[PDB]
């Protein structure tokens, strides 16, 4: 759950560091005030994407051996869809009486 | 007739949740479960100098269950690459009839330990995770236990290999071997 | 280039319809069963989660699309089916048409293989029941319509549907092979290895002679699902000849019956009292049936 | 086939890309040059190595800007659905259709409790009236 939001936060911030350090190698370049810090930013967000790279790569490798958490709780799905089958018989008969006791009346 | 193919295992007291969800995810079964029990080691060897184990492991959280008792010792010198075990002998029991049977033909008591995790099993396997605690009969090491044991009749030790791929499976957690 | 990633990032961020790319598959796998990663996807609704079944498990649906999953063909039923069940005139003649009488993309384009994948095991299990069926009755086997007679008037003919008592017994049927299923997975709470049933071994303390070693398993499949509609051609029948009772004698004392509301798979219970008309202290005679399915009254 | 050196390769895969990146990133910031050293061929030779120097910069990024994109995509398809070690949606799931179901049959055994009370008045009616 967390692990995926990580790592978008990750993949953005890497894009956003990309953006930085072309603006202020721009910003440097064109001529000649806060270029020493926005180069300074860049270079460490660079180093921050590349260390939560490394960090979610180097993660506990959970199985890689065969296909993990086999079984998707299939039978609690099979139960809720005889429920809903079960609900759907008896509003249908109960459609049915009702017809019947409105020919009655 | 009967053997068996128990490997011992040991992991760290804190390293669980990679043992837990890998076992229920990887391939144990549908809707885990745990248990409770406590062993009762026993020997009655005067001249024979040969004390024969009988573990009365009773699950005191059990409706009655019988005391599943078992007998093992002896490794059998296999050397085929497997865990390393003897034959196995189940015995089930009665009510209060292990300790009963003990008195009547005579035992003691070498020590008692109980046992508390969570369980698996697998298709001709059966591995479980366990805490042994040492305090009196009301009621520990501080390291977990994963009982990765196969019984079965002799055969031709194919599921030496199988067993063998499982714990290569479980690899980055924990790493089986035998034991002496 | 660095703006027109963060664009594209933004747009991808703020609409979480289009984000097919590990998003939907995220929500799917959430949603629906394992995948074998093997090159994009794998792993169907095959019921090999309950075990012991036959294999014909494979890759369903591995595509980008345009709220964008791939649905696509399995391997390949890939149409609605359900089992049917009636009894009206038997006769020889088979072969006819199985007329079939019919929120996310992947559902319902799953379900639907589900379905019939169940409804394959069951004409399985049913060929492999009535192959060794016991000399009880006839047992007729065509393609699909495996109708059969186990007394007469009272003919069924539970019959596999295709896109190629007529409903619950029908989920009932259903309920009962997902419920073999979840038999073939039972916890001993076990500490050596005993790795079996609680019942098989509850023979030890208490050595039943020959109940419980008969009990403790017995056979199922064709035999059950005929005893159901026996016992509801036979409760059919009761009802039908208690209304007729009660609308031929008419200057007779009228009949008055009270069914149960505890009707059990097999068995019922159906009370029914004399009470001549406008007296209650002459119910003199007041009777109890039970209507079992195997047998009479 | 190896799904664990497979990884391992693709994660040294992505380091060493994002290093190249980072060092030809490094190299055309160091490479500037400001001061007119070109003295054979300024005016060719300076604005050839120039434009040279510039569009491998551009080529470098967004071929970093690709190889960094393509790692967290792949990243994050091994860790949605490939091996995550969170097997809790699973119960989930469990607890949510069983609650589902546990309602349904609870409305069911309602319904059919007031219709059996509704069929026992209406059978103490029809029974005892006949003419």
Same mark, same amino acid.
Not at chain 1, 68 to 92: F, I, N, T, W
Not at chain 2, 102 to 122: C, I, Q, Y
Not at chain 3, 250 to 258: V, Y
Not at chain 4, 60 to 84: C, H, W, Y
């Given at each position: 759950?967390?692990?995926?939001?990580?790592?978008?936060?990750?993949?953005?911030? /890497?894009?956003? /560091?990309?953006?930085?350090?072309?603006?202020? /190698?721009?910003?440097?370049?064109?001529?000649?005030?806060?270029?020493?810090?926005?180069?300074?930013?860049?270079?460490?967000?660079?180093?921050?994407?590349?260390?939560?790279?490394?960090?979610?790569?180097?993660?506990?490798?959970?199985?890689?051996?065969?296909?993990?958490?086999?079984?998707?709780? &299939?039978?609690?799905?099979?139960?809720?869809?005889?429920?809903?089958?079960?609900?759907? &018989?008896?509003?249908?008969? /109960?459609?049915?009486?009702?017809?019947?006791?409105?020919?009655?009346? | 007739?009967?053997?068996?193919?128990?490997?011992?295992?040991?992991?760290?007291?804190?390293?669980?949740?990679?043992?837990?969800?890998?076992?229920?995810?990887?391939?144990?079964? !549908?809707?885990?479960?745990?248990?409770?029990?406590?062993?009762?080691?026993?020997?009655?060897? @005067?001249?024979?100098?040969?004390?024969?184990?009988?573990?009365?492991?009773?699950?005191?959280?059990?409706?009655?269950?019988?005391?599943?008792?078992?007998?093992?010792?002896?490794?059998? !010198?296999?050397?085929?690459?497997?865990?390393?075990?003897?034959?196995?002998?189940?015995?089930?029991?009665?009510?209060?009839?292990?300790?009963?049977?003990?008195?009547? !033909? @005579?035992?003691?008591?070498?020590?008692?330990?109980?046992?508390?995790?969570?369980?698996?099993?697998? @298709?001709?396997?059966?591995?479980?995770?366990?805490?042994?605690?040492?305090?009196?009969?009301? @009621?520990?090491?501080?390291?977990?236990?994963?009982?990765?044991?196969?019984?079965?009749?002799?055969?031709?030790?194919?599921?030496?290999?199988?067993?063998?791929?499982?714990?290569?499976?479980?690899?980055?957690?924990?790493?089986?071997?035998?034991?002496? | 280039?660095?703006?027109?990633?963060?664009?594209?990032?933004?747009?991808?961020?703020?609409?979480?319809?289009?984000?097919?790319?590990?998003?939907?598959?995220?929500?799917?796998?959430?949603?629906?069963?394992?995948?074998?990663?093997?090159?994009?996807?794998?792993?169907?609704?095959?019921?090999?989660?309950?075990?012991?079944?036959?294999?014909?498990?494979?890759?369903?649906?591995?595509?980008? +699309?345009?709220?964008?999953?791939?649905?696509?063909?399995?391997?390949?039923?890939?149409?609605?089916?359900?089992?049917?069940?009636?009894?009206?005139?038997?006769?020889?003649?088979?072969?006819?048409?199985?007329?079939?009488?019919?929120?996310?993309?992947?559902?319902?384009?799953?379900?639907?293989?589900?379905?019939?994948?169940?409804?394959?095991?069951?004409?399985?299990?049913?060929?492999?029941?009535?192959?060794?069926?016991?000399?009880?009755?006839?047992?007729?086997?065509?393609? +699909?319509?495996?109708?059969?007679?186990?007394?007469?008037?009272?003919?069924?003919?539970?019959?596999?549907?295709?896109?190629?008592?007529?409903?619950?017994?029908?989920?009932?049927?259903?309920?009962?092979?997902?419920?073999?299923?979840?038999?073939?997975?039972?916890?001993?709470?076990?500490?050596?290895?005993?790795?079996?049933?609680?019942?098989?071994?509850?023979?030890?303390?208490?050595?039943?002679?020959?109940?419980?070693?008969?009990?403790?398993? =017995?056979?199922?499949?064709?035999?059950?699902?005929?005893?159901?509609?026996?016992?509801?051609?036979?409760?059919? =029948?009761?009802?039908?000849?208690?209304?007729?009772?009660?609308?031929?004698?008419?200057?007779?004392?009228?009949?008055?019956?009270?069914?149960?509301?505890? +009707?059990?798979?097999?068995?019922?219970?159906?009370?029914?009292?004399?009470?001549?008309?406008?007296?209650?202290?002459?119910?003199?005679?007041?009777?109890?049936?039970?209507?079992?399915?195997?047998?009479?009254? | 086939?190896?799904?664990?050196?497979?990884?391992?390769?693709?994660? *040294?895969?992505? *380091?060493?890309?994002?290093?190249?990146?980072?060092?030809?990133?490094?190299?055309?910031?160091?490479?500037?040059?400001?001061?007119?050293?070109?003295?054979?061929?300024?005016?060719?030779?300076?604005?050839?190595?120039?434009?040279?120097?510039?569009?491998?910069?551009?080529?470098?990024?967004?071929?970093?800007?690709?190889?960094? *994109?393509?790692?967290?995509?792949?990243?994050?398809?091994?860790?949605?659905?490939?091996?995550?070690?969170?097997?809790?949606?699973?119960?989930?799931?469990?607890?949510?259709?069983?609650?589902?179901?546990?309602?349904?049959?609870?409305?069911?055994?309602?319904?059919?409790?007031?219709?059996?009370?509704?069929?026992?008045?209406?059978?103490?009616?029809?029974?005892?009236?006949?003419?």
């Amino acid at each position: 759950n967390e692990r995926l939001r990580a790592l978008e936060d990750i993949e953005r911030e /890497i894009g956003a /560091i990309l953006q930085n350090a072309g603006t202020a /190698i721009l910003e440097l370049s064109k001529e000649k005030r806060l270029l020493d810090r926005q180069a300074a930013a860049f270079t460490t967000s660079v180093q921050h994407v590349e260390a939560e790279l490394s960090a979610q790569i180097r993660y506990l490798t959970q199985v890689a051996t065969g296909q993990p958490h086999e079984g998707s709780s &299939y039978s609690s799905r099979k139960d809720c869809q005889m429920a809903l089958k079960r609900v759907d &018989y008896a509003r249908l008969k /109960i459609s049915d009486v009702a017809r019947t006791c409105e020919q009655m009346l | 007739n009967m053997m068996e193919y128990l490997l011992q295992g040991s992991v760290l007291d804190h390293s669980l949740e990679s043992l837990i969800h890998r076992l229920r995810g990887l391939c144990d079964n !549908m809707e885990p479960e745990t248990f409770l029990d406590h062993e009762m080691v026993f020997l009655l060897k @005067g001249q024979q100098a040969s004390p024969f184990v009988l573990r009365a492991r009773r699950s005191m959280d059990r409706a009655g269950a019988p005391w599943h008792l078992r007998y093992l010792g002896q490794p059998e !010198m296999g050397d085929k690459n497997r865990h390393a075990l003897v034959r196995n002998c189940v015995d089930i029991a009665t009510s209060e009839n292990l300790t009963d049977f003990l008195m009547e !033909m @005579g035992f003691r008591m070498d020590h008692e330990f109980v046992a508390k995790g969570h369980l698996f099993r697998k @298709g001709i396997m059966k591995v479980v995770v366990y805490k042994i605690f040492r305090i009196l009969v009301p @009621g520990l090491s501080l390291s977990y236990l994963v009982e990765l044991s196969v019984v079965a009749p002799a055969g031709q030790d194919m599921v030496s290999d199988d067993m063998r791929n499982f714990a290569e499976q479980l690899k980055p957690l924990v790493h089986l071997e035998k034991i002496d | 280039g660095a703006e027109r990633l963060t664009k594209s990032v933004a747009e991808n961020q703020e609409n979480k319809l289009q984000r097919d790319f590990n998003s939907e598959l995220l929500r799917l796998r959430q949603h629906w069963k394992l995948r074998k990663v093997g090159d994009k996807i794998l792993g169907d609704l095959s019921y090999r989660s309950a075990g012991s079944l036959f294999p014909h498990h494979g890759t369903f649906e591995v595509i980008k +699309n345009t709220d964008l999953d791939k649905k696509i063909p399995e391997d390949d039923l890939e149409g609605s089916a359900y089992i049917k069940v009636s009894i009206q005139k038997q006769a020889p003649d088979i072969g006819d048409l199985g007329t079939v009488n019919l929120s996310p993309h992947w559902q319902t384009k799953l379900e639907a293989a589900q379905n019939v994948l169940l409804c394959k095991e069951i004409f399985a299990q049913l060929s492999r029941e009535a192959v060794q069926i016991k000399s009880q009755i006839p047992h007729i086997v065509v393609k +699909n319509q495996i109708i059969s007679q186990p007394f007469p008037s009272l003919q069924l003919s539970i019959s596999l549907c295709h896109s190629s008592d007529h409903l619950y017994v029908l989920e009932h049927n259903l309920h009962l092979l997902i419920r073999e299923f979840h038999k073939q997975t039972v916890m001993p709470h076990p500490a050596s290895a005993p790795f079996g049933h609680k019942r098989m071994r509850l023979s030890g303390p208490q050595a039943f002679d020959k109940n419980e070693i008969n009990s403790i398993q =017995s056979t199922e499949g064709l035999l059950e699902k005929i005893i159901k509609q026996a016992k509801h051609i036979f409760l059919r =029948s009761r009802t039908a000849a208690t209304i007729d009772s009660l609308a031929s004698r008419i200057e007779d004392p009228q009949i008055q019956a009270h069914w149960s509301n505890i +009707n059990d798979v097999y068995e019922s219970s159906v009370k029914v009292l004399i009470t001549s008309q406008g007296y209650e202290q002459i119910c003199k005679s007041i009777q109890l049936q039970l209507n079992i399915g195997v047998e009479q009254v | 086939q190896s799904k664990e050196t497979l990884l391992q390769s693709y994660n *040294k895969r992505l *380091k060493d890309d994002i290093k190249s990146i980072m060092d030809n990133f490094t190299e055309i910031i160091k490479t500037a040059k400001i001061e007119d050293e070109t003295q054979v061929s300024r005016a060719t030779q300076g604005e050839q190595d120039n434009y040279e120097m510039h569009v491998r910069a551009a080529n470098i990024v967004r071929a970093g800007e690709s190889l960094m *994109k393509l790692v967290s995509d792949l990243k994050q398809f091994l860790i949605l659905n490939d091996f995550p070690s969170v097997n809790e949606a699973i119960d989930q799931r469990n607890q949510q259709l069983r609650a589902l179901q546990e309602e349904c049959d609870r409305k069911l055994i309602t319904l059919r409790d007031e219709v059996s009370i509704d069929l026992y008045e209406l059978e103490e009616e029809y029974y005892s009236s006949s003419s």
